[PDB]
Structure 1
């Protein structure tokens, strides 16, 4: 259950609650950031490549 699942997510639901965030990049059901459309692994990956604007490693 993968592409079949990421697909069921894309489409509009039979009820309003069943809105669940998938990663747009890998399809991950869990730990998905609204602000990016990404799960935390993907999140970390692009930010590392640099393909995430303003996003840098925080040191404090």
Structure 2
């Protein structure tokens, strides 16, 4: 049932009261932060490759 979330992204949320953050490919609506707009699993796995600008394995 991903098309519900997809069209809800396309269909205008009548107000800001409809709070949900998603990605155009990611189906989950949780922890898809506005800083990168992608799933936590997606983000961590692609960050093992180090492709996001300024994202490296943290060492303080």
TM-score range, shorter chain: 0.7 to 0.9
Identify unmatched segments of 5+ residues in structure 1: none
The aligned length equals: 60
CA RMSD, Structure 1 to Structure 2 (Å): 1.9
TM-score (norm 2): 0.72
TM-score (norm 1): 0.72
Identify unmatched segments of 5+ residues in structure 2: none
Bigger fraction of residues in strand: 1
Q: Which runs of structure 1 show a deviation greater than 3 angstroms over 4 or more consecutive aligned residues? A: none
